[PDB]
Design a protein around this nucleic acid. Sequence first.
DNA 1: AGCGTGGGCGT
DNA 2: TACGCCCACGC
Length: 87
Amino acid sequence: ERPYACPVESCDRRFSRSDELTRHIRIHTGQKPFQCRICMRNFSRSDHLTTHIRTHTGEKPFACDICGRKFARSDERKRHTKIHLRQ
DNA sequence: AGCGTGGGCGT
DNA sequence: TACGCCCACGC
Ligand SMILES: [Zn+2]
Ligand SMILES: [Zn+2]
Ligand SMILES: [Zn+2]
């Protein structure tokens, strides 16, 4: 089962790993340790900060295998690729 | 479309 | 524990 439960009285979510609960607590504490150097916006997660910066830089590492169109995030590419399916 | 952001991991 | 993938869900 999931032994790590959120100690917040209003929350009843559970987790299987320690660090996942630790990350979840930041939702309640509102902790946002990672800041964008460009627009000074704060983020709760380092990886989400990385993808956010691409909105400023215009970096798009992920290209569609079918047409070559580039995207800032991998899930953006995945959502796109399926449109080449014409049933 | 553009993108915030939590969840579920693997390392 | 932190780091950073994929993956979802949502607007
Ligand atoms: Zn909670
Ligand atoms: Zn920014
Ligand atoms: Zn394409």
